[PDB]
C-alpha cells in the first residue's frame, strides 16, 4: 500500500572538542537502510539493509559526497545559527533537519516534507504546498528569505515529487520481502499483583512491523482510558517492535477484561480474552 522514505540529519557542536558531530540516518517507513557518523572510522555513508546492500559504487560514492556535503553545510549553520541568536562559545547547540516524501496506496506520490529546527525547537519548515515556508521565529526569516528567495522550495519541490519518490519505489522493489511484508504481533499476557484488593493486567505485543499499532482494554466490553499505562512503541532491536498496555484491575475481576489489538499485520483485529 502506502510507504515513505525520509531522512534525519543531526549536527551537534561541541566547542573545543574539535568539529561538531554529524549524523545522518535513512528510513523507508520504520526500516533503517543507511547511516553516516563523522565519528565512525567509516567516513562513508553505510548500508544497513540487505536491499540497499545491492547498490553498486555509483550509489555509495554519490551518497557519501552528498552526506559529506550535508555534513558540512550544517556544520556552518551551527555557528550561523549561534549568530542569529548571539550565544557564547562555551555551550553546545543542536541543529536538526528531516525530509522525506510519502506515497499513496499506488506509489504515485502522496506528499513531501522538509523541516529544520535549532536546539530542539521548530526553526523553519516547508509549507504543505512545497512552494512556501513557515519561519515560526523572528530571525528565522533570515533563512526563510535566503530560501524562499534563492529558490530552494523550487528545486527541492522537484526532489520531493521527483527523485525522492522514484528511489522510494526502487527500494520498495529491491526490498519486497522486507519492506512490503508485515510481521504480525506475537502477543501474550502478564498478571502482576498489587495488593489484597488490586492487581495489574498487562497486554503485550512483541516482534511486529510496522511499528504502527493500537492496544486497548475492554472491561466487559467497555474500553478503559486515562488509567492505563502505555509505554511508547519500543524497538525490539531486530527490526521489529514491541509495545504493551497495562491496566490496574480490581483483584478478582480480571475475567471481565479483554485486550484489544489492531495491526496492519492482522487480518481481523485480535481480541485477547484474559480468562477465555
Amino acid at each position: 500500500g502506502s510507504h515513505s522514505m525520509r531522512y534525519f540529519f543531526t549536527s551537534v557542536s561541541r566547542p573545543g572538542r574539535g568539529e561538531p558531530r554529524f549524523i545522518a540516518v535513512g528510513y523507508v517507513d520504520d526500516t533503517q537502510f543507511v547511516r553516516f557518523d563523522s565519528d565512525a572510522a567509516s567516513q562513508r555513508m553505510e548500508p544497513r539493509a540487505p536491499w540497499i546492500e545491492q547498490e553498486g559504487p555509483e550509489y555509495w560514492d554519490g551518497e557519501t559526497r552528498k552526506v559529506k556535503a550535508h555534513s558540512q553545510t550544517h556544520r556552518v549553520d551551527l555557528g550561523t545559527l549561534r549568530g542569529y541568536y548571539n550565544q557564547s562559545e562555551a555551550g553546545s547547540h543542536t541543529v536538526q533537519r528531516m525530509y522525506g516524501c510519502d506515497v499513496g496506496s499506488d506509489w504515485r506520490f502522496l506528499r513531501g516534507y522538509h523541516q529544520y529546527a535549532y536546539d530542539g525547537k521548530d526553526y523553519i519548515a516547508l509549507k504543505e504546498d512545497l512552494r512556501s515556508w513557515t519561519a515560526a521565529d523572528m530571525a528565522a526569516q533570515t533563512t526563510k528569505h535566503k530560501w524562499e528567495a534563492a529558490h530552494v522550495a523550487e528545486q527541492l519541490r522537484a526532489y520531493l515529487e521527483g527523485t525522492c519518490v522514484e528511489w522510494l519505489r526502487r527500494y520498495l522493489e529491491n526490498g519486497k520481502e522486507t519492506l512490503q511484508r508485515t510481521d504480525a504481533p506475537k502477543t501474550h499476557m502478564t498478571h502482576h499483583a498489587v495488593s489484597d484488593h488490586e492487581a495489574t493486567l498487562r497486554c503485550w505485543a512483541l516482534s511486529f512491523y510496522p511499528a504502527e499499532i493500537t492496544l486497548t482494554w475492554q472491561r466487559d466490553g467497555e474500553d478503559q482510558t486515562q488509567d492505563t499505562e502505555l509505554v511508547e512503541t519500543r524497538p525490539a532491536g531486530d527490526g521489529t517492535f514491541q509495545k504493551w498496555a497495562a491496566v490496574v484491575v480490581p483483584s478478582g475481576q480480571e475475567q471481565r477484561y479483554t485486550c484489544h489489538v489492531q495491526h496492519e499485520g492482522l487480518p481481523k483485529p485480535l481480541t485477547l480474552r484474559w480468562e477465555p
Binding site: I23, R48, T94, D119, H192, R234, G237, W244
Partner: protein, 93 residues
C-alpha cells in the same frame, strides 16, 4: 528547552537473548548509556544511530546479548539528570 529521556529496560524476546535500554523523547542529544550486570558496566555496548521524532526529541537503543538468568539494569546520565538514573530490568516492566 531540554528534556529527560524515556527509559525502557527490556529484552528483545521473553524468558522463552538480548538486553535493551531504550532512551527516547530526550533533548539535547549528548547522552550516556550503560548496560550493567549486578552493577558492573557491560562492555561492547552496542547502539542505534541517533534519530528523533516530530517534536525533535531524539531516541536511541543500546543492546547486548544475554539470558534472563544475577541483577540487571540500565545506567543513564543525560544533562538533565544530576546523577545517573539507573533502571533495573523488570522481567515484566
Amino acid at each position: 528547552i531540554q528534556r529527560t529521556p524515556k527509559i525502557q529496560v527490556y529484552s528483545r524476546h521473553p524468558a522463552e537473548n538480548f538486553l535493551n535500554c531504550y532512551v527516547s523523547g530526550f533533548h539535547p542529544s549528548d547522552i550516556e548509556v550503560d548496560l550493567l550486570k549486578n552493577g558492573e558496566r557491560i562492555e561492547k555496548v552496542e547502539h542505534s544511530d541517533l534519530s528523533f521524532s516530530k517534536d525533535w526529541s531524539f531516541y536511541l537503543l543500546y543492546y547486548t546479548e544475554f539470558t534472563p538468568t544475577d541483577e540487571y539494569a540500565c545506567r543513564v546520565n543525560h544533562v538533565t539528570l544530576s546523577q545517573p538514573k539507573i533502571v533495573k530490568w523488570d522481567r515484566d516492566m
